[PDB]
Write a protein that binds this DNA or RNA. Structure first.
Lengths: 131, 135
RNA sequence: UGCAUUAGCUAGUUGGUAAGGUAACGGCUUACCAAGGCAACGAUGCAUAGCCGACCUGAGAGGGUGAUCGGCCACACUGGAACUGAGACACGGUCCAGACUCCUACGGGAGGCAGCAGUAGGGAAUCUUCCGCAAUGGGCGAAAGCCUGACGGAGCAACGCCGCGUGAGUGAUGAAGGUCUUCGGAUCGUAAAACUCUGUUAUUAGGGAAGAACAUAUGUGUAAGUAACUGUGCACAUCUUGACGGUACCUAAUCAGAAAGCCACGGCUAACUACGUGCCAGCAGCCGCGGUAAUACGUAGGUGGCAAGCGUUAUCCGGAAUUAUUGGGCGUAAAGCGCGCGUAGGCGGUUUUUUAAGUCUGAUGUGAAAGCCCACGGCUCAACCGUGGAGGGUCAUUGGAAACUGGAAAACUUGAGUGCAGAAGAGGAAAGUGGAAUUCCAUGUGUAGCGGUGAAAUGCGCAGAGAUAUGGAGGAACACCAGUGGCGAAGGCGACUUUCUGGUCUGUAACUGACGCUGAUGUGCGAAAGCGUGGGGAUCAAACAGGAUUAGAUACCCUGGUAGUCCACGCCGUAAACGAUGAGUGCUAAGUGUUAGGGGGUUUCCGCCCCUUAGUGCUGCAGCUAACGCAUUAAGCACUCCGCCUGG
RNA sequence: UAGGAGCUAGCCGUCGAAGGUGGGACAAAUGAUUGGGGUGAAGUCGUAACAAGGUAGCCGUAUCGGAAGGUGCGGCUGGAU
């Protein structure tokens, strides 16, 4: 159900930030935590705290929100399943919403990121529409 | 509806019903064929006018027309105008329209085609005809 | 090719080896190969087909677009054999069938519109049995020629327009002008006569003219020059040339000259109120009006929106994304499944890691017209034409490499699969708990209406109908356990001792590694009305009887009673089976008392307090739709599938 | 004599549009034929249902009905009393 934490856990989190619940948990991962690490570095939240267990353990979350009790989590989504993924390459990739959007990241040629490849001509990957 | 198991049928819009069988009909008389080629030139024959013993309350005293053009095929149409020579054996042409205070009737018969009368009672709507087109 | 209210398709078949023959190559036929091969990739078969651009155009997405118009196939009286031109089944080739045509003097001969016009014809539409090769064109031909019905032209045209079109306002507002009068002079009006300003288009009459040049046409002679001047190219240059032009350009000849209609005068239709107009005629678009006060029917001087102007007809779209990845939902509304149970699948949770195959190719040769950027020329503006760059910045061509993947090596675990109490079990069934009045009363009787009933008669009434019990039996048929409870695929599931306690079920869950929902498979039934045997008229029960309301039955009424009712052998695929609301991962402030199963404290005297979930209900946050109203358990929220329908 | 093999003159099997035969399929007229709806005052029936439509009852459902209507058995609220 959690291809993305924004898939099913957001059912909890979208209210949890309405009620200022600024810390939560997540399945253990390295790319999933990486993208949230990008977002917390951008300053969405405080920080991606780390895993307690090894295999699908609880990565801690620590969700800061807007000082005005605002939330710019404008939807993030994916379709991963054995049967649905990208057997397919960002040797070129464009952007949407004039660079405000920043979201999921997955490929294989040479390490940059979604927003860290906006200028490369070997781009990244964007899903969300932030503004 | 899904997308990946939607490959067996796309998620799309819908289709058309029947509309005006006479506007776009033809006829091939070679081998009892029945054709269609989308022309306003399709004909009939001048038969009838009347009604029958009511059940519903629609009040109107105006001319009915089972009345049509050269080659016979039975329809239900309208004869516009009061002065008319449409009793039997007439040929005409037809266009569309409905003037108010007329129940449900929705076509016409053009004036002065082969075998009909002309328009008399309207003198302020004067300068029509648009093609042989002076002032 | 598209299409199952077109499905099981096919048989030297499934197209190598040997013989054969295509410039090439074969089951193309033959000695061998398997019944194979083809499959709801809807093969088979039906329908259809010359194909692209073409246009219009939805916000972009990008697309439907063939008439023309361009390109690319096939056919040229149909057909069949052969010949053939290198190739032909030949737009104007033989034999022909065929078919008709004509001829016939009969003896036999053939013809032969799909070149392009018009012929009969038609139409809304195709000109005109149009011009000539003038030019250009090409096939054969030095030279030269023709075909031209190629080519270009001549007419046709709001099919659709276009510039000019309608030029001058000054002095009496009244020199003259009248929809609507209990008229005031304003008045369609310094408009108006007569023209301030004038001489374009307007017709015009010819000087006429360009265009009218291209193509050779002449040896003077050059190049090829062959042994060399030469025939052709041609420096000469003899000056041609219209399918068009004594017309254009021009004098200005010309004069305020030779050139403008719509629904209405209806709210929305802005076009004024009126009369014959009294829902009549009839104008009549959303909708009207009209009935003695029509604005409106009819009519009108103006009169309105734009002018070669006026309204429609078939197509697409604006309208209206009211047609939805982009840009629809499905309770009611356009739509959400008695149902659930199921294989492929769609999607089921992943945590690491390698490739460069795709995830705005690098940069360029690089790009279809009415259609990728600008420059253009002509267009009376236009009407419409074309031209170059940009050739793109759009394909090809070169690239290899994240934090997904296809591929490659590991494991993990929520969506999957292995203890437990077995509580309730009505899941759905397996043995017991082992039988009466109502049917006669034989013991015994005692009576007229029991009755059917609104009230009554019928049925029942004399063994004396209904009667009595030790006694004399059974015909259809075995209500505890009582709240907002437990189960099945459902219809549904009810006596209990029991069953499997299957399964729910919560406390433990002892554990390998995605092992599931919906969905090809397939799963079963679904209640009754009715449903294929004894019962069954025993009860109930239609029908009948027989009764009658108050001023009405045979009906509300029904015993006798027609079946039927009903159980020991066959079910349908229907109910308000309704959740009008399909079934997986999880929440939506949450609360709520509680069945189950647990942790328990306190143990109570089996109870008070806390955590608890499948639910149980109750409300209640968000959300929800128009509101009905739904909601921690949808009529919400983010990841699964299903089907429905976007007019009915 | 080509007589041998040969092809035309002669004999053994082939398809051919063609040609005409045959039973189905579709039609179209329609038959002194013939079923569904609508339609035009509904004269036919009460306002039958909507005010418990005059009696809340309903849904599958024997049932007859020129037409609004009715009686049988399983699930139901879509109800004033």
């Amino acid at each position: 159900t959690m291809t993305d934490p924004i898939a099913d856990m957001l059912t909890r989190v979208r209210n949890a930030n309405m009620v200022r619940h600024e810390k939560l948990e997540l399945p253990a991962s390295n790319i999933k935590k990486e993208i949230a690490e990008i977002l917390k570095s951008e300053g969405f939240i405080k920080n991606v705290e780390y895993v307690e267990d090894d295999k699908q353990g609880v990565l801690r979350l620590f969700l800061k929100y807007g000082q005005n009790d605002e939330r710019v989590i404008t939807g993030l989504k994916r379709i991963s399943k054995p049967g649905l993924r990208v057997y397919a390459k960002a040797s070129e990739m464009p952007k949407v919403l004039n660079g405000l959007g920043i979201a999921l990241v997955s490929t294989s040629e040479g390490v940059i990121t979604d927003k860290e490849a906006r200028k490369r001509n070997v781009g990244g990957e964007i899903i969300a529409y932030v503004w | 509806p899904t997308i990946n198991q939607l490959v067996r049928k796309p998620r799309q819009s819908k289709i058309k019903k029947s509309d005006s069988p006479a506007l776009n009909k033809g006829f091939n008389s070679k081998k009892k064929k029945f054709t269609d080629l989308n022309s306003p030139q399709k004909r009939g024959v001048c038969t009838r006018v009347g009604t029958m013993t009511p059940k519903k309350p629609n009040s109107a005293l105006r001319k009915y027309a089972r009345v049509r053009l050269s080659n016979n095929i039975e329809i239900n149409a309208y004869i516009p105008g009061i002065g008319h020579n449409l009793q039997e054996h007439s040929v005409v042409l037809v266009r569309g329209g409905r003037v108010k205070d007329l129940p449900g009737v929705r076509y016409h018969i053009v004036r002065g085609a082969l075998d009909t009368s002309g328009v008399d009672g309207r003198r302020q709507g004067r300068s029509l005809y648009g093609t042989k087109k002076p002032k």
